[PDB]
Amino acid sequence: RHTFVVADATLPDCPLVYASEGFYAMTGYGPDEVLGHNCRFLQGEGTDPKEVQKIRDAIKKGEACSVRLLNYRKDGTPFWNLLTVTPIKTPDGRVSKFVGVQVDVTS
Numbered sequence: 001r002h003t004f005v006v007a008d009a010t011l012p013d014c015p016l017v018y019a020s021e022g023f024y025a026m027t028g029y030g031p032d033e034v035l036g037h038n039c040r041f042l043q044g045e046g047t048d049p050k051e052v053q054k055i056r057d058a059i060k061k062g063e064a065c066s067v068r069l070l071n072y073r074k075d076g077t078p079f080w081n082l083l084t085v086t087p088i089k090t091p092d093g094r095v096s097k098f099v100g101v102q103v104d105v106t107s
């Protein structure tokens, strides 16, 4: 059970440009509120800043990354998000998109 998104790395703040139906269903947000925005809107009071830093650095480096983050649905309730970001590069080495697999691991 997992969800999938695509961020556009050609734009400076990596906006999400595509989300799977499960990502909407899992987070409670619609596309009108998801597309065009950075994924960090799912973060909140309990989100570990040291893990948010690992993703920021990997993205700045064009590296893959796997972190576990506390996220919040639209209704404010928390859930544990096992998130894996993969860079996609053009043949000239530039990163074009980041792709994310997100798993709710609250169990």
Ligand SMILES: *[C@@]12=NC3=[C]C([C])=C([C])[C]=C3N([C][C]([O])[C]([O])[C]([O])[C]OP([O])([O])=O)C1=NC(=O)[N]C2=O
Pocket: 005, 006, 007, 014, 038, 039, 040, 041, 042, 043, 052, 053, 055, 056, 059, 069, 071, 081, 083, 085, 086, 098, 099, 100, 102
């Ligand atoms: C989010 N999923 C997600 C998926 C992709 C493909 C990318 C590139 C990022 C995310 N994020 C995080 C966010 O966009 C950002 O990378 C980090 O917060 C670090 O940068 P900042 O500026 O905030 O320090 C995801 N973040 C979430 O909280 N939940 C996800 O599902």
